[model samples]
Target: PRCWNCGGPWGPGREDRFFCPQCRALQAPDPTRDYFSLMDCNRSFRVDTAKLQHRYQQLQRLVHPDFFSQRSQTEKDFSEKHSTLVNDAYKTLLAPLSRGLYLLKLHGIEIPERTDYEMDRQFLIEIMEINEKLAEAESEAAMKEIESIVKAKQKEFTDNVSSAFEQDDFEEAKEILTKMRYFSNIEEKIKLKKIPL
Candidate 1:
């Protein structure tokens, strides 16, 4: 984008930099900017958490609303939005499941909330059976069994998500991600069930 201060369009390569080169002034985040780009990573289902954390630490060095109030009204906006952009990108990138979901959207496919009504026919049956198993999962050993299944399922689906992205198989990625979502919920439910009343 052209610098809001300098009125000169920044070219490619440096086009997305945090500070406009000509004026050396901070710019407001596009907000619509890709989380992948914001995280300084490639477009993929898997990312190095260390790399992501490193990037976030670098960004945090320059931001925080508590201290940026020294600037002008417009500069205040620059700092606030920058913080959000960096913060949102950090959280989303660091989580595997969320990172996968965001990758799915980046490819023009969005599985909206509760669209679980339509899922792979067999997976729907399988998911139902798992949840049913949890309904009667009162025994300690049975809970362990369910927990093992959920953990294995989570790893398998997550690995497949990585493979699907590599193959550019958004179709396969879609199904696996839906299944992953179901298991992710079950994983959480399992923890809650294990806690004594």
Candidate 2:
């Protein structure tokens, strides 16, 4: 595809990038670009978050709508579209759980929410026990303990996911992500009981 601004013959490899080399004009968002490539990061489960954070703000500065308000209406629209695309790409890659799920989806695998989908019986019983413990905690100390346990479990499963992905073992990665999903639910429930209101 040619650059929308200059109509220069900038095809795929260069066109999907931020700007055209010849005209130095911003290009339209390419639907074929994946979240990792858009942010200039390698496609992997354990992404470099520190650089991701920095790059996000850097990209926003050039594409921000506020900077384009004085430009032509056509350019204005271009920036608005680009800004949103960058936001969606950034948000999806920012978290471990969502990132893992997305990576799996990219590989044409969908993690089902049902047990017969191969969820372990032992893990299911453990999740029930943990929920029961959270619901019955009447003291701050006990509640805090549960919070600590949940946080630890989240990290543990995330580490397992990273390892599984590194080994090209999508099956184990899917199972770990399923367990991560359950722990994530418990984390949200803990927050509900934690508020001052």
Best by TM-score: 2
Instruction: Locate the minimum summed-lDDT window of 10 residues in model 1.
Output: 10-19
Q: Which digits, one per residue and each the tens of the lDDT, describe model 2 over residues 1-197? A: 77777779866454247777887776777788888988888889988888988878998998899988888787688899989988987888998888998899888898776454477688878888898899898788899899999999888888889999999899888889878888888998888888863
Kindly provide the TM-score of model 1 when superposed on the true structure, using C-alpha atoms: 0.89
Residue runs of model 2 more than 4 Å from their true location after superposition: 11-16, 113-118
Q: Pick the candidate with the highest lDDT.
A: 2
- Candidate 2 local Cα displacement, residue 38, angstroms: 1.2
Model 2, TM vs. native: 0.90
Give the per-residue Cα lDDT of candidate 2 at 154: 87
